[PDB]
Amino acid sequence: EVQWKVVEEVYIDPTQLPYDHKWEFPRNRLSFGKTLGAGAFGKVVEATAYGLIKSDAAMTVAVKMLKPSAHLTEREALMSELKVLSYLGNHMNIVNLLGACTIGGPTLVITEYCCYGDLLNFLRRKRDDELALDLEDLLSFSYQVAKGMAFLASKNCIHRDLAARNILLTHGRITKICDFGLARDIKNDSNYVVKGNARLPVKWMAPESIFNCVYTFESDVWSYGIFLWELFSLGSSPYPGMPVDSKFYKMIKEGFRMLSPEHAPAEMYDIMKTCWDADPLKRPTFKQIVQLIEKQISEST
């Protein structure tokens, strides 16, 4: 199933969205490289596309595709993902669609290549790129993820898996929102727990998504709060030493929340606390979050 939801300004069926043939690119002008990320059914591979944006210029791109082991329903879901990406349009703070190969073979989704890879591994390596990481970087990543999230919300799009492992970093320390989806081995990632029917990122999920399967723009805002916690603790897994079980669900239902990370400015922990409000209607919108971090950046400067 396609994970990203698009709501009517009622859910829009992604198969009903259009595929603009302006994105069509010939497969024989792609030269594949190393695998950047891989799951059981899909992968993201680095590639050199020849004459994609500029007429004759070669450029590094990332290709989303499936492995030969993928069934028909997955190939359809990749086409549906390409239509959502095409519908979303362009924004600085998302991993943008550059082209696609849908004729004469399997679907290949061509997007921007972000040289630093995922933010979670970037933050983890910066514990204990040659350059050091400071508070000015973390505040900028918070600001850019929020702009990217408010862009998605403006397109009536609920991401449903916002976490540091789905945020890429590129030249200039620009954070772009992504979703590895089938390009990650969730069968071997302890952040996705088995619900008996599927593997979910429970520690990033709002109470109403765990208890009622309700994913709203507000639930996404909860996940952003968990992301801020991850980011300001330099890649620490949420709720340390607390396994996802009956005890975890009880405290979450009761109103238990994580403690402020060490590197978090007080105004930033208040942002987390408001994203974690039990009542979704009392949580800030991404548009309100952007204005808050804009104020925090000017106070710093």
Ligand SMILES: Cn1cc(-c2ccc(CNc3cc(-c4cnc5cc(OCCCN6CCCC6)ccn45)ncn3)cc2)cn1
């Ligand atoms: C709702 N909503 C969906 C999206 C969305 C969904 C799907 C997509 C598809 N596109 C991609 C692209 C990339 C990608 C691009 N560049 C890299 C570079 C990478 O690594 C390099 C660094 C290695 N390290 C260097 C030292 C050793 C390791 C890894 C991954 N990517 N990953 C995944 N999907 C796009 C957007 C956005 N919003």
